[PDB]
Curated annotation (Swiss-Prot), chain A:
Protein name according to UniProt: Outer capsid protein VP1
EC numbers: 2.7.7.50, 2.1.1.56
Reactions mediated catalytically: a 5'-end diphospho-ribonucleoside in mRNA + GTP + H(+) = a 5'-end (5'-triphosphoguanosine)-ribonucleoside in mRNA + diphosphate; a 5'-end (5'-triphosphoguanosine)-ribonucleoside in mRNA + S-adenosyl-L-methionine = a 5'-end (N(7)-methyl 5'-triphosphoguanosine)-ribonucleoside in mRNA + S-adenosyl-L-homocysteine
Keywords carried by this UniProt record: ATP-binding, Capsid protein, GTP-binding, Methyltransferase, mRNA capping, mRNA processing, Multifunctional enzyme, Nucleotide-binding, Outer capsid protein, S-adenosyl-L-methionine, Transferase, Virion
Residues annotated as transmembrane: none
Enzyme class, UniProt record, top EC level: transferase
Function: Outer capsid protein involved in mRNA capping. Catalyzes the last 3 enzymatic activities for formation of the 5' cap structure on the viral plus-strand transcripts, namely the RNA guanylyltransferase, RNA-7N- and RNA-2'O-methyltransferase activities.
Pfam families linked to this entry: Reovirus_L2_4th, Reovirus_L2_6th, Reovirus_L2_7th, Reovirus_L2_8th, Reovirus_L2_GTase, Reovirus_L2_MT1, Reovirus_L2_MT2, Reovirus_L2_N
Length: 1297, 346, 86
């Protein structure tokens, strides 16, 4: 359905009834001319600029549009303001003449002849006499036509109005008038088709067909004559266009006759596009028709082509794109350009000289004249029906593939692609990392397990390879722009604000502390000093005290002093020394040089801290040589040490932090250090692997990169299910290269054709899917062929603008896990349960593995495109027992489906799985991975992602968008063990080593680092359970597995030659042989008992959590052998109290015995603001009695209104692990008959006392002469030592605070 | 001028089984040119506004009240997942159906806030393009609002329309989660369509109703399936027959009314029933004198209008003053004029 | 179609029930967002929305929810007579 460059929709529409003509009554004519305003009544401005009072193009209306201005007007146009004045004058004058004769009261009913009226009016404002016309202004329509009424006087009435016995000749009036300032070159000006010229054509009205023949005989030698057949306005008439051309409308492809045709055709199309059954119209067929000097045999000139289109337009066809109501020059040019494009001419209906053929099925209705006749084309594709137009889209569109049953060989797909693709392409990366940090902290002094420094892991050998360095730099660019140092410093100071000394449980920092920003203050970005200082001076950082002063040093300082930190320094000393110094600026890869620089700066940094101070240092390269010297030299200079590691971009730098600057420290290299380093390098390797898929910046995308973009461009495509249709072939080919990713679509209109582009991101996942194909399926074209809007141009950017939500991260991680798991060579088949109709699993699995997938819904993909032996889809519900009939496999899986299926089944998990797993076993399956939702680590709801219900065992997703049951891990595992006693079990969650990143970055999706911790926690709530029946299970003697205690573990096995490894937090923690083994989690002894065919492991875990174990032999991959959990020590602290007689309200308060584990050091604290603050000792204190801890405390009249807690003591935080309310003191009464004690309850806790309902004292500002009997107590005993206590002789009092 | 006279029919509530083959069907002349023409004419006559906005608002008003029968709690809930499966079509001045703004804002009373909304169809911008007649890789939702037309590729080809309707119904159900709810607009409730409905989807939901807003004269309806589940037992029942009979009755009633109205373009030559009659006189001199033409014309025109109002104007020209008297002629006036034996003078 | 449309009958007996002071009793918030506070025999007792962390002697958090909506828990009071300011 296309003609040359014109596109047509397959539906026909046109109006169904013709409005009859009625002449204008005499009175009505006067009303129109006497209208107080003639704009919109007699003429209309198509171009009015309201900012000025001007327009430039005017459209005229019947009484006026017959005018042909004299040339003096044309060659010197007037402006709009003169125009409106001129017309209003002439109209009134013309009325006077018409009324000077023919008084109204005797003539209002008579009908004016439109032809006479037009001619008479036209001469009048041409300043030419009109007396001849006035005699014949009226006619009797019931007795004659407006033509025949005139033919009664067959002679030359005047030079421009000549009438024969049968016909009338007169110049055609100007439908448009151009005022001063007209300019066709301006593309936005309204089009006029040249009708503004005074003599663009000439009309010949005729009364009968023989007269028409007579006229044509005369005109045969001139230009082409045009005519309307449907409804010729005032009467049947030919018109002869001027033989010239008109400027500006095209590249001189035009003569005047062509212009009349093409604009007429446009009107016909516009009417078809909006005709309605309920509306009558003056004319069904707006087209002109040539009747002289014409070639039906050729289509190489505009006039021929327009005619060939007009013959088709009369049937009621519509264009795919709407055409303006008031076309501008640009609009017309586009139409002509398309009309002149290369293409076939339609030949459904042949041209005939003076008769038009119509399709009987068309909505068109012929008039009574003989000019129309029905006709039957053989293969006409159109149908009747309306079609609406949709507004254009501001965004590139996305489509979802849907396939026909047709398919195409790979070679055809490729060659169809290679000649339609934008093979070398220019793209933009965008930003991969949007913000945030993944930060981790490692206390080193806390670990007692000594570990020799020489055995520490060292930098990987390739760490300074160009390629890895290049990727390292590339990743640095890809982060969204911000102040790296600002975020980095903020993270460290957040830790420092929480740092508390271990011995006395008070914060290391304090108000007015002295600080030296020893790091290079470097006028970062827009500021002259590191921006973090502004927050520090302002107390913006929560929990951080205000320093008294800050001093700056380095090379790039302005508000400080310059010096080299590698040498001795002439300085004072400070409480906090913040040494943010680079080492690389003078050592690119020279490690020993870097080591010397690091060691020297470390020494100087320590030397600038006061006793009991704290210093931190940034180290670029934590090298084992560096560590060796650290403990060789500075081992005694501080009390404690930690490692703070923010991750902003991929880097191996770290932050040391030395607490408690003193002379006699005893720092050691310990296994905590080894664990941190192993984790650190693991992340860097993981990140590097992800970056490998990304192309570098300047390179155009020739299709060698993994993460590139593929695009195909087509001009005016005609998609169809016809074989070898190139647009369809290219479409299917490109889709096959993108499927897992989204598919974009755009339509951009050029001045001629419309360019369509289809594109998407190619990924390694798409490569895997494409490898699974044996043939390329064809798409369903309806969605595309229906698109007739216009869109914004494509974008071609790799990374989106918005970071992905947490849920997607978990999905990618599990995809990464499955993708790895399915690589086991000993798998011959697989059954997938609850697949989406989109069989996404195909993208993860190696193409050689047989797969069967299932769902209640039908599959979304043409199964004929795959080898049936390798892939199979079964539609059904695996909740039902009937589902298992003929189902055979060796392994199965169900991910993100079990909980939903259980919810649909209206049952708990335990019941659901109990009737499921046996069926899988019955199906011959051996091992399976199942995504059960359950809290492995602890029960704790994620604030919006997951809400845990307790009154019924249910999860709430996304604030209740989805609702599923859950079970507890221990009961579930026992239930599973009951079903299968001889199968191994293991758990899997998202690794903190981030090895799953390539499934996020390598797929082109952006990320925020701060979400990672949540994603891990999310995974902790939704683990994957791995069940394996082809191996005996693990076992351990103390099943509760308490921490820090010897435990024996049995791994039955046949080969003493095998090798063992144990992992924790995604990194190996124990590994070796029965002869020798190495561990970083406590004492480990490995032995093989041949008599039992077991490996015996005796172990004393030093940290809790999940541990999984593997066995390996030299010619095999590692084999998982289950996993075990280590539990933390109990949280039960208990206090023991004296009798009320020993409730010591006296100055010497009483004492209470504490019963608790030594693992939790304790101190008395107040939950002041959401954080516990340590109380001064003189009101309460944990007592370090030799056999056990005790608790001394004193009683004060504020105690009942406040809450205090026994809090866990760690240098990282206070009350973190446990915080026990000391409830008794909250509810202890005071004897009225004794001297008592009172003080303020808070640091700024103003209070007042009311003795037995009588106001007593403002304890903040007590009476200068105190009330009788009260006195200032000796010992402070308040909440904070600064406040004193006041002793009251007796009585009962209130506390208003 | 506006408003709607809607009606709701609970179908599952009726226990009286009724075989689908005996349902009333579309009237034979329903696709006659004249009735179609009047149908279009009525569409123009309504005051301009957003038809879909009013239509959607009525349905969602019902949905906000929908409550499960077994446990007497609302079917919808806060944070529910919704897919506007109907063609988001950049309606009027907006890029998406306007009802979404009210839904996102909780403007509709009693309706909870959805967690997210997804859009599909042919004319979407903020969604995805796809054909609803085939299988779809779309996941699932709690609420599926399928405002899809069927006529856009089937003008009067009923079997083609039936296949489209059945196919779209099936996919719409498949996109609903268990216990979810889905609605579907049907252009032509044909007995053939109803036959297939109970042949295929009889077990996919717990309950069913019919929501019928009337904005212009049309036979389209809204199905609503509640409690998306596997083992439903829906049947054709006498409630369906009652609703259909009432529906076609209104459609016929409206069509009869429209017959009196003339079409748009035609000048009022006095053949229409609802036309206007007017008389113009210049400087008339009314009097009780016999054969006074102004008096005669006045009496004649009045006799043709009496039940309706009579209007009167005097417009001064530059010379004489033109007077005009006019009013609406109706079939009521024709009956009265038939009662006359002579025309009284005023 | 709707809840309580055709009929809706108040259970007036519950509106008149007298609570025995000499027994443990039950309290909770009355609405979905129904903040409330208790006054024991004219003496202010508790903000039942946020009862004090050192609970008044004898009172306890009840096991079964029994509130207007299951999200709110009930609090059992050992004895006494109380007011309801909401």
């Amino acid at each position: 359905a296309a003609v040359f460059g014109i596109q047509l929709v397959p539906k026909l529409n046109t109006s169904t009834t013709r409005r009859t003509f009625l002449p204008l009554r005499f009175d009505l004519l006067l009303d129109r001319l006497q209208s107080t305003n003639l704009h919109g009544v007699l003429y209309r401005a198509l171009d009015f600029n309201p900012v000025d009072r001007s327009a430039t193009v005017i459209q005229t209306y019947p009484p006026l549009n017959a005018w042909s201005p004299h040339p003096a007007f044309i060659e010197n146009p007037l402006d709009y303001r003169d125009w409106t004045e001129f017309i209003h004058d002439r109209a009134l004058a013309f009325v006077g003449v018409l009324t000077q004769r023919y008084p109204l009261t005797q003539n209002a009913q008579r009908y004016t002849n439109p032809l006479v009226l037009g001619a008479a009016f036209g001469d009048f404002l041409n300043a030419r006499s009109i007396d001849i016309f006035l005699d014949r202004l009226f006619y009797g329509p019931t007795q004659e036509s407006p033509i025949t009424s005139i033919t009664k006087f067959p002679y030359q009435w005047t030079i421009d109005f000549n009438v024969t016995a049968d016909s009338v000749r007169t110049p055609a009036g100007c439908k448009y008038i151009t005022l001063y300032g007209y300019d066709p070159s301006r593309p936005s000006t309204p089009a006029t088709y040249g009708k503004h010229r005074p003599t663009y054509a000439t009309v010949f009205y005729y009364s009968t067909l023989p007269a028409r023949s007579r006229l044509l005989a005369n005109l045969a030698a001139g230009p082409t004559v045009l005519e309307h057949f449907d409804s010729p306005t005032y009467g049947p008439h030919l018109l002869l266009p001027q033989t010239g051309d008109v400027l500006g409308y095209s590249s001189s492809l035009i003569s005047q006759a062509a212009l009349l045709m093409v604009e007429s055709v446009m009107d016909a199309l516009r009417d078809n596009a909006n005709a309605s059954a309920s509306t009558a119209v003056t004319r069904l067929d707006q087209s002109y028709h040539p009747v002289t000097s014409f070639d039906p045999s050729t289509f190489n000139t505009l006039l021929q082509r327009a005619t060939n289109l007009a013959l088709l337009a009369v049937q009621g066809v519509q264009s795919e794109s709407a055409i303006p109501a008031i076309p501008t020059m640009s609009d017309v040019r586009s139409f002509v350009a398309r009309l002149m494009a290369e293409g076939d001419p339609q030949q459904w209906f042949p041209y005939r000289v003076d008769q038009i053929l119509y399709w009987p099925e068309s909505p068109f209705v012929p008039p009574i004249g003989p000019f129309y006749a029905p006709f039957r084309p053989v293969n006409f594709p159109f149908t009747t029906g309306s079609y609406t137009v949709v507004p254009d889209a501001s965004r590139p569109l996305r489509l979802l593939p849907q396939y026909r049953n047709a398919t195409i060989t790979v070679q055809q797909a490729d060659d169809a692609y290679e000649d339609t693709a934008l093979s070398p392409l220019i793209t933009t990366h965008g930003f991969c990392v949007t913000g945030g940090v993944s930060t981790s902290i490692y206390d080193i002094s806390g670990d007692p397990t000594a570990y020799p420094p020489a055995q520490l892991v060292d930098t990987p050998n390739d760490y300074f390879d160009r390629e890895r360095m290049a990727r390292r730099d590339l990743f640095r660019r890809l982060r969204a722009p911000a102040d790296r140092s600002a975020i980095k410093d903020r993270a460290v100071f957040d830790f420092l604000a929480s740092l508390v000394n271990p011995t006395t449980a008070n914060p290391v920092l304090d108000t007015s502390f002295s600080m030296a920003y020893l790091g290079a203050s470097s006028a970062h970005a827009n500021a002259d000093e590191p921006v973090i200082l502004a927050d520090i001076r302002s107390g913006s950082i929560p929990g951080l005290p205000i320093p008294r002063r800050i001093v700056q040093f380095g090379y790039d300082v302005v508000h400080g002093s310059l010096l080299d930190l590698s040498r001795a320094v002439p300085t004072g000393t400070f409480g906090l020394v913040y040494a943010d110094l680079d080492q690389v600026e003078d050592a690119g890869t020279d490690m020993p040089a870097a080591n010397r620089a690091a060691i020297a700066m470390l020494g100087t940094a320590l030397q600038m801290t006061t006793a009991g101070g704290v210093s931190v240092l940034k180290v670029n390269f934590p090298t084992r040589a560096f560590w060796t010297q650290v403990f060789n030299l500075y081992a005694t200079h501080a009390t404690t040490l930690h490692l703070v590691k923010p991750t902003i971009v991929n880097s191996s730098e770290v932050f040391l932090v030395f607490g408690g600057r003193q002379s006699n420290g005893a720092l050691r290299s310990t296994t905590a250090l080894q664990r941190a380093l192993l984790s650190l390098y693991a992340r860097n390797a993981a990140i590097d692997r992800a970056v490998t898929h990304i192309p570098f910046f300047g390179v155009p995308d020739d299709g060698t990169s993994d993460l590139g973009i593929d695009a195909v461009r087509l001009f005016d495509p005609m998609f169809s299910d016809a074989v070898a249709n190139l647009p369809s072939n290219a479409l299917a080919s490109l889709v096959s290269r993108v499927v897992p990713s989204s598919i974009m679509f755009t339509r951009v209109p050029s001045n001629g054709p419309v360019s369509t582009t289809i594109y998407g991101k190619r990924t390694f996942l798409s490569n895997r899917r494409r490898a699974r194909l044996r043939d390329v399926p064809m798409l369903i074209t309806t969605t595309l062929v229906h698109q007739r809007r216009f869109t914004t141009p494509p974008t071609f950017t790799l990374f989106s603008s918005e970071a992905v939500p947490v849920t997607t991260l978990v999905a990618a991680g599990y995809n990464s896990f499955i993708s790895e798991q399915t690589r086991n060579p000993n798998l011959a088949h697989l059954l997938d349960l609850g697949t989406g109709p989109e069989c996404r699993i195909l993208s993860l699995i190696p193409p050689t593995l047989q797969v069967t997938m299932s769902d209640a819904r039908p599959c979304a993909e043409l199964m004929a495109s795959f080898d049936p032996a390798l892939t199979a889809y079964v539609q059904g519900d695996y909740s039902t027992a009937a589902f298992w009939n003929g189902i055979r496999c060796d392994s199965a899986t169900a991910i993100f489906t079990l909980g939903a299926a259980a919810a649909a089944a209206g049952t708990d998990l335990i019941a659901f799985v109990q009737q499921l797993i046996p069926r899988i076993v019955a199906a011959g399956g051996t091992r399976m991975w199942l995504q059960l939702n359950t809290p492995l680590y602890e029960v704790s709801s994620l604030p919006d992602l997951i809400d845990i219900d307790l009154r019924d065992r249910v999860y709430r997703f996304n604030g209740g968008e989805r609702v599923e049951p859950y079970a507890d891990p221990v009961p579930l595992q026992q239930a599973i063990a009951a079903l299968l006693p001889a199968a191994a079990l293991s758990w899997h969650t998202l690794s903190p080593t981030c090895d799953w990143l390539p499934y996020i970055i390598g797929v082109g999706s952006p990320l925020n680092l701060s979400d990672i911790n949540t994603a891990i926690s999310y995974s902790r709530l939704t683990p994957i359970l791995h069940i394996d029946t082809t191996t005996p299970p693990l076992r351990v003697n103390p099943v509760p597995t308490p921490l820090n205690q010897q435990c024996a573990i049995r791994i039955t096995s046949l080969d003493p030659a095998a090798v063992l490894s144990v992992q924790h937090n995604g990194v190996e923690v124990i590994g070796g042989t029965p002869g020798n083994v190495i561990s970083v989690a406590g004492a480990a002894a490995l032995q093989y008992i041949l008599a039992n065919q077991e490996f015996l492991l005796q172990f004393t875990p030093t940290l809790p959590g999940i541990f999984d174990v593997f066995l390996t032999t030299l010619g095999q991959p590692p084999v998982p052998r289950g996993s075990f959990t280590i539990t933390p020590p109990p949280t039960t602290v208990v206090l023991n109290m004296p009798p009320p007689g020993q409730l010591d309200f006296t100055d010497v308060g009483n004492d209470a015995r504490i019963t608790c584990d030594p693992y939790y050091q304790l101190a008395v604290c107040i939950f002041k603001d959401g954080q516990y603050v340590r109380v001064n000792p003189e009101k309460a204190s944990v007592v370090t009695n030799a056999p056990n801890r005790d608790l001394h405390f004193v009683l004060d009249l504020a105690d009942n209104h406040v809450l205090l807690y026994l809090c866990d003591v760690t240098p990282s935080g206070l009350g973190d692990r446990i915080a026990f309310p000391i409830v008794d003191i909250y509810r202890i009464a005071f004897p009225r008959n004794t001297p008592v004690r009172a003080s303020l309850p808070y640091t700024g806790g103003g209070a007042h006392l009311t003795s037995g309902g009588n106001p007593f004292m403002s304890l903040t500002t007590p009476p200068a002469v105190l009330p009788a009997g009260v006195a200032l107590a000796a010992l402070s005993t308040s909440v904070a030592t600064q406040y004193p206590t006041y002793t009251l002789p007796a009585g009962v009092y209130e506390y208003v605070i």
